[PDB]
Amino acid sequence: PPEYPGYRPFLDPSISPEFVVASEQFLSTMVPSGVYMRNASCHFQGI
Amino acid sequence: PPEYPGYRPFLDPSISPEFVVASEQFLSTMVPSGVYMRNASCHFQGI
Ligand SMILES: *[C@@H]1O[C@H](CO)[C@@H](O)[C@H](O)[C@H]1NC(C)=O
Numbered sequence: 001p002p003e004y005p006g007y008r009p010f011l012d013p014s015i016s017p018e019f020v021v022a023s024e025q026f027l028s029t030m031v032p033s034g035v036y037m038r039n040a041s042c043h044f045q046g047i
Numbered sequence: 048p049p050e051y052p053g054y055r056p057f058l059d060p061s062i063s064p065e066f067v068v069a070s071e072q073f074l075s076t077m078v079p080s081g082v083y084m085r086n087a088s089c090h091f092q093g094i
């Protein structure tokens with residue numbers, strides 16, 4: 001993202017309904033079927 | 048002023064009370080005491 005320009009008191013920060021689809025409903029294409037568990041030193045069998 | 052970037056639906060265009068002073072109340076320093084009248088070809092005695 002572009003660097004911080006400063007506080008803009010006139011920018012409207014509201015959330016749009018299209019943002020609910022672009023961000024949250026899109027993340028489901030990446031959710032896996034199982035999730036691992038790991039040691040502190042490379043051991044995966046459920047800690 | 049900078050060139051037109053495009054319609055920003057989120058910019059707040061409201062008028063501020065400081066704009067009433069910066070623009071309108073400042074113009075009084077330039078109003079003259081009398082105003083001329085002119086011909087179409089450089090004649091000033093009240094047309
Ligand atoms: C990794 O797991 C083994 C056995 O599961 C355990 O002995 C060891 O302490 C674990 N490593 C760490 C850093 O806790």
Ligand SMILES: *[C@@H]1O[C@H](CO)[C@@H](O)[C@H](O)[C@H]1NC(C)=O
Pocket residue numbers: 086087088090094
């Ligand atoms: C300028 O004024 C004179 C007399 O006041 C008049 O004869 C003349 O027509 C005027 N010029 C124009 C372009 O009207």
